[model samples]
Target: KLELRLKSPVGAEPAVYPWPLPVYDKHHDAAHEIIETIRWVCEEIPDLKLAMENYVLIDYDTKSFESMQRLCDKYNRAIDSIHQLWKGTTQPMKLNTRPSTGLLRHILQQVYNHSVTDPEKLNNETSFDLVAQMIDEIKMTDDDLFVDLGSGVGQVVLQVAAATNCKHHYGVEKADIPAKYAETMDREFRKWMKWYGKKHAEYTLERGDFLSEEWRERIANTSVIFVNNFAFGPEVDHQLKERFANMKEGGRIVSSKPFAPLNFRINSRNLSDIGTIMRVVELSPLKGSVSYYLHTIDRTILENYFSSLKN
Candidate 1:
């Protein structure tokens, strides 16, 4: 079985820094050297320079650490919360050191194909270590089911299923190309399990809007829902909240950003409603120099509100 425990911090001698700080510095140094080397190479070839410049500009959203540093600075507290978890561990835990690069290649191919098929590019992945930690914190059991909303190529769904004891894993993606890719990835995962003589939770890949009744019904009983909505707008978030209201009581939501009043993007009324139905359970700092918040549905609050209405 794949060991998914968060890597315990080495002895106290280890260096610790805030989320993204150490990571960004290390990455920046490496990237700086690569960028400068490429520039020097481009000096010899004008076309190479143009190609490198175009690639840098087009891939800035994913490749730029400077942009990530700005966001981390903007939300320093939220990022700091990660350090507090894991008993003052200075860094995110590596859940699986030997993640499959083949799977990653498959996901990248899907993203490239999807970008060609639609104007909206595929959703970027979150920090793998953080997602594993969140899954561990959720305490999934054999009876529990998990779902990933807007699951891009179903990486989280597959990883969570492998890491946890969940009975079922479901991924919902609206885009046709990525959804198709997710299905293919699912098959590939199953094949690997058989080949390696390993067992994991069963998974399903559905191609549809997550809020659609069909997909909602599929996830209604899920014990945990992962939503990396960093790129999502307020309108979509409102819809997500509306759908979440119907989730099973005690269900948990893991999101890239906090829900409710802290989430300025959501409308006040919708945020208020979400607050009533769900309570912040935990906030885990992530390795990607980002943070994830876990919220639990509190049916008691909703019941009380309805009971008062009837009275």
Candidate 2:
């Protein structure tokens, strides 16, 4: 089975940096070339040079770094909680729609188009706001983790990487188009880390099925698994829960709906009767009233699994 445990969880806590640092040394040398190119523009047209001086970090937000630092710290601590149900291996959550392929096709064919028209794009700030609120209310701890399944467009990934720079951010996507977009975003965002001279930013993206073992292993490491719940249904809900069982204490799934996996062996019919993924066991007006048999991952298991890394 695919395993997501870190090789060594016993090492000393690495000193946390306050900002991000790029791994590429040559990127700086390339920046000089861009500066030289700017010089050419200025020399050719003095008017252009004056105009350039007016340019001030466009495409940048004014949110204070201190605020961002606090947000990251909170999310990281929340991830330290365990919210998983079972530790059994995971599989790729199958796409309800299939992608088309052709020899000369330059772009992917759209599938299962959304019912809404021209949906508003949720960028870094808006996405981060919603995510931070959701995670904060869930009450996470220091050892918790976060996993982004089918991380399309990378908007959430970008925000999480910036906000929770201390947390283990795992981004997984299945399509090539969105994968490229996500990588590009990561590169662009890395620039701000250099500006602040803090190296706290780093994240990983994997291309594969959300329910597949590769992803399951990653989910096993997550304290908060965020899914848009756009394509999730009965066929994969069982798979989703089985993976949740792997969490080492505090792992939670944030989704809109849940379905039971349809099977011929144990279950013969369509299993919509299995109920929604997020079910409340009881009703009480005092606070929130509801409890269910959602099993959680164990901390001892998580710590033991990650203590033997070769790195």
Candidate 3:
């Protein structure tokens, strides 16, 4: 089968100058993050070599560290546009699946004869570190709310409940078996992770489709929302968009269903503004289908979505 090369738009990784000392350190971190982000995109999306190229040219020889730092910072900010949206304002990033290491890390680990099971052992460490860093960016606190969509066995929900002082944590699962397991896991994992007093512990679980109005209302009031790795088809996706049509402006949605843009203008159909439509911008296995896609939405809607999810 012909796998698409996964090339990014030619200027995705826009060249940047480096910075000095502490600032340089920040830029260095961003550089590392940018690299990891691109690698993740390539794994599922298609033809993003151009995006990867933006992070490669680390200007070690730039006269001043500040110059280098500025360039790297610029690059990170530019590429991070997608990354930030993908995260969708989740706080204290919950860890179910690490976002950093893509399949690439696994292949490399095998090549180098490394232990590939635990996230800590990979040579690139990007798989573990990248995701960890992302989780850190969410920065949830005890007073916030955490919601998990398709929380498998509630591993992430449990982690979130135990790790932070969220006001409430909710898990939605349609599967009878896994949902049961997740509930049980939540009860047990909380014993250890929730070392704090019971006063801080809060959680709830439901067995139903996540795209239903029932789930939407719960999420609409949540302070933070987390999504594991569930990507549904267009019908379900559209349902999610419509179901949450009234999602409070601050509610955020972070799922990796091929970066669908939140907005669009359909000239052909006389539709002035498509309204919070989930456009499939890209997909994983770029070789098989279009890996990346984008759509548009009302800024108020995006803001409202993030507002509801803010920790």
Candidate 4:
């Protein structure tokens, strides 16, 4: 008989995972090593195959144990009540069948490698649980048209529609794989809503780049826009400002991080008249409330500015 025990890093912060730190290639290498080492162990001791059946891969540097536990619990995974970090303690063996390492590594690598090459198309998504916070902050209603820029897999868009009364939703995704997955999630979400006897808003998961004119035209009309711009690069960032320059007034923009015309070098003299600060809220992971920015466009003010410019 054999046992495998796990422990958190000796002196790392409460929710931080120390290894595979900072460098992307280093993390990639470490993940490969860890998975291969585990595979070798499983091969060496067949009994341990069952031990590795269900597991949680902690991204503690970016996510909290509580957050991961909640996410896991949503799928009905049973968590060990005892803390496993203590000396001589063992991890939970009760299996809930979390994502496989191969899948997890593949997803991470896709985001990392693509972020380096074409970051504008990185498929990283806003966490699903934050949908409620976004809905609340936006004061979303049946009258509102919700749109998610770069809505990877459409989780946030669909989840928001499911949780709120917002009548129409749109998710613009450029990546073929994630857009396909979003379509699948959309179908499943509709079925789930029907079975749950819940009413949901109509949603379109469009497979197109948000920067494209076809998608931009649709997004410009939205009442609330959700931007998860954490991984976007400078060119994409510039495009976002240009998009804002033409957005309908009275519309709101909700972002995972702070945004200002000045930050993006949109001459304040131009866009300052178009949009106004609405509010800011703290996001998850102990970040400042300023992590979330809610900005409202003043149609009257913007129209006047444009009129004056034309004159």
Candidate 5:
């Protein structure tokens, strides 16, 4: 059985995984992440685009004593080929100047690994593809100010800053270790991006409780806010809703949990709820267990609700 195969477009024999697939942790099975990492890099590199084709991740099973070895082996050969091809293409500043989401992500992957010494502490870390999609969907302009509440290691914020056109990007993290790592990430991001001849928008990672007074003001002023609230308790989610209430009209809140109902009722009984002044729609296409919801401040709903009360 061809367990792990990186199907090459060329008539030549496709490469094999270089080593055995080591099971990562209790969460899932093997090092599929490592598989995808190299697999992804293999597909996206343009220098190899002429020679390489998309990979086929075939069925993987448990009780794999020997075949797992084949799995890892398949992925490595592909990567070695990539390096061989990439190494063949040499110097010149202009060639690397072109804008590429793939290249930006490549730099990000390097910085992330260097920052997170232990894999034990982290979240989904937010995929580059998701961030790219989010930026395109939101259509942020230079006038916009974007903030990521509870931003772990400021990964999302930095990526957004690099790709989107925003006045400023802010990542507010309450945790100490993540914030500390974020600082290192900040410096590394700049150096790496510079080394790659890439440019990114201005960004800052702040260590502060978003519920604090200063942050409250910033949240109210922000045009866009992203919070991964899936892990948050009910109380915290409630508090966050209170903060979102003060945001100016047209402000957008992207969160893992819905702050407002899908179809909000603009009645007196629901007046105190954020839904009355906002519109909630589910944002699609997540990478993991979490799905995102977009909440937009629409004063018109409140305007109509108030007028009806007068009637």
Candidate 6:
């Protein structure tokens, strides 16, 4: 029997996983994850990156017991050095720097595996790669507010909070178990981020329904809205369209299901649909949230209409 302890920088209990390193998904397995975790952490942190020159890099294979044991023993020790070096320091350790897509994904993978015990339930998780692309493309400012609707465990929210400096990040979930799980996720996310000394943008995770009257108001105020509506029923999607109608000009919404027709056409009688008020463009393939649309509230669609009628 072999054991793997992915050490914690902050002295929280060591993170243990199944022996032989279980496969996570079609993308990666636990073996690959552990290797990348250590490798990426060294690259992302300057102090760790520079301090790591002294340590000898080791290679391992998943099939060999000798390789797995040596890999963990060596990396855990390397991580220990990080803990001691970070124990007390005059230099800033805040994680203000945005991490690359791969690093953030593994960090989330490890964090979630430790935080949530039984993972079969949290259904509406967003793709990390998809969200990363949104954060990059949207370019939210301090002036903008962001929200993730139906955020099962708020993984997307936590990741976004760490990545962007938006005014605030909100994760709203309307479930019992995952809502409870989200609270723990919030605490654990903060704990680990601090352990690494990284700073995350302000955010909140709550067990509130997006359809509620309060959320509609918040919807209008939010500059960026992220929703996983790929599996959402038409009624709920239609309700969201109603709320999105109130969004201010230039507001951007990222969703798995397009709120308006991607190729909306107007003649004159086409006066009412959300497509008339906004321009919806299909984003690249989701790879997981499965497909996405970026809807921008450009009243100019209507503006052009009125301009044509008046002149």
TM-score of each: 0.54, 0.43, 0.43, 0.51, 0.68, 0.79
Candidate 6: segments with Cα more than 4 A from true spot: 1-35, 45-56, 60-95, 122-126, 286-290
Best model number under TM-score: 6
Clashes of each: 1, 37, 63, 2, 12, 3
| Candidate 5 residue lDDT tens string, 1-311 | 43454443222344333335434445433345444444454444544433334433455443474544555555456556655654576622242332367666766776776566666766534567877778778888888999998887878998899888799999988888899899989987876565444568889999999988887778899999988787889898898888888999999998878888897776757778888878889888855625778889998987887788789
Candidate 5 regions exceeding 4 Å error are: 1-99, 121-126, 286-290, 309-311
Poorest 10 consecutive residues by lDDT, candidate 6? 90-99
lDDT sort, best first: 6, 5, 1, 4, 3, 2
Candidate 6 deviation (Cα RMSD): 4.1
Give the per-residue lDDT digits (tens) of candidate 1, residues 1-311.
21111111211221112322222221333233233323333343343344444443322232455653432232233223333553564444443332243333333333233223332454433356666667657888888888888886777787777667677888888888787767767766654344222446677878878777676666666778889888889888888877787788888888877666444233335435678777774475753455567888876765666676678
Worst 10 residues of 1 by lDDT: 2-11
The TM-score ranking, best first, is: 6, 5, 1, 4, 2, 3
Q: How close is candidate 1 to the true structure, as a TM-score?
A: 0.54
Task: Point out the higher-scoring one by TM-score: 2 or 6.
Answer: 6
Tell me how far the alpha carbon of residue 291 in candidate 5 is from the true structure, in angstroms, after superposition: 2.8
Error of 4 at 257 (Å): 3.5
Candidate lDDT (C-alpha), each: 0.57, 0.41, 0.45, 0.52, 0.71, 0.78
- Give model 5's TM-score versus the native structure: 0.68
Candidate 2 global TM-score:
0.43
Cα misplacement distance, residue 4 of candidate 5 (Å): 29
lDDT per residue as tens, model 2, 148-254 = 77787565654555455335676788887667666655654443233212243356776778888666676767777767664567567767767765554545666
Question: Model 4 compared with the native: what TM-score?
Answer: 0.51
Better of 3 and 6 by lDDT: 6
